[PDB]
């Protein structure tokens, strides 16, 4: 059991990727023509 | 007739999650607010009123469900009076020293009223003490399914996981196929909740025939979930025999807009109706995923894979399809199609290489030996690291 | 039948329609059952049969 006092604790003053969203692409401009 | 009783009411949590999302429409949010306030008034959701007002809603809107202290005290006093009455019944049965079936039933009554207002801890204590009797295995199954339903009610999926693994551990000591189908439906719902969809597809597709667990959700929502998972996982043969021809779905398609949209998307995918596939996918994303609870957290995951499935179906047969033809088929601009298709290739999810100089979308056919070898190498590395860690842990001791 | 000897004479009458429905429900929780089976209708059709 070592306290690891040389390395201080930093101070502060089912999932993989899919971090972006496609939103409403729709793209009805093709349907315009 | 026998019933496990609609305790806790699932619609309470359903409309609570419908309210807590800004993505959903304002009108539907106000309808959910009206329903939840009416149910809080009638069925005495005083502890759940306090929880919903102090967490959930205001944790992240929230004007409609305003934390009224007076309404939190009157209904709480009524609830405590009912709990006192149930305690009187339990103590009078103990004083009369009646049959142990009766004292167990009184314990179930206390626990089911504790669930009826939302307090998880005391309900769990009451049903844990209730299990200590020597009641029949069916009663134990029903009780621990009640704690599983409570875990579903508060949207804590690990609670449901532990409850259902406890169900499975002792389900071999029973055998009653109705009490096993109840557990199958519960396990399928839980599996659908945590991003699995593989076991969920099988259990929900099976459960369309034997669905007597109306205390979890209505039959229409079960059909919706089963159709979604079957579309999302099954292959072009399983779709033809499980989701597109099932008489249970056929009799219920023309009963709900969500079911109609999902069935239309499924039949468009199976019938090569690639022209209107994307608008149907958007309609399903708007009407079936966001309003629900177990699906709205997976709105992105389902949508991303649907595009991959349609691209794979289109590019399996053809080998030198042109980008312009693909864009015309899907009713999108060619540049947008290239942008969309540039995401599934780098991860080797799709099977093609886009030749942008000409517009050719020439197909590349891989060898399953390579993918199997890579998967085996990764799995062996993981297992070996786990084993080394455990062995280092145990050799020192 | 003499008093002092065997004491309680308990009747098991042939089950009524509600009793037949209960027995059918109890013995029906052993097989895969399609949703919404009106067991009360079947028991109401079952007249004379018992246990």
Curated annotation (Swiss-Prot), chain B:
Pfam family, any one: RPN7_PSMD6_C
TPR repeats: 104-137
Protein name per its UniProtKB record: 26S proteasome regulatory subunit RPN7
Function as written in the Swiss-Prot or TrEMBL entry: Component of the 19S cap proteasome complex which acts as a regulatory subunit of the 26S proteasome, involved in the ATP-dependent degradation of ubiquitinated proteins.
Domain PCI: start-end pairs: 196-368
Subcellular location: Nucleus
PANTHER family xrefs: 26S PROTEASOME NON-ATPASE REGULATORY SUBUNIT 6 (PTHR14145:SF1), 26S PROTESOME SUBUNIT 6 (PTHR14145)
Disulfide linkage: none
Gene: RPN7
UniProt miscellaneous comment: Present with 51900 molecules/cell in log phase SD medium.
Source domain of life: Eukaryota
GO molecular function, one term: structural molecule activity
Assigned GO CC terms: nucleus; proteasome complex; proteasome regulatory particle; proteasome regulatory particle, lid subcomplex
Biological process per Gene Ontology, one example term: ubiquitin-dependent protein catabolic process
UniProtKB/Swiss-Prot annotation, chain C:
Subcellular location: Cytoplasm; Nucleus
Family from the record: Belongs to the AAA ATPase family.
Reported function: The 26S proteasome is involved in the ATP-dependent degradation of ubiquitinated proteins. The regulatory (or ATPase) complex confers ATP dependency and substrate specificity to the 26S complex.
Post-translational modification: N-acetylated by NAT1.
Subunit structure and binding partners: May form a homodimer or a heterodimer with a related family member. Interacts with OLA1, TMA17, and UBR1.
Anything else known: Present with 4700 molecules/cell in log phase SD medium.
Organism per entry: Saccharomyces cerevisiae (strain ATCC 204508 / S288c) (Baker's yeast)
Full protein segment contained here: 305 to 355 of 405
Superkingdom classification of source: Eukaryota
Protein name: 26S proteasome regulatory subunit 8 homolog
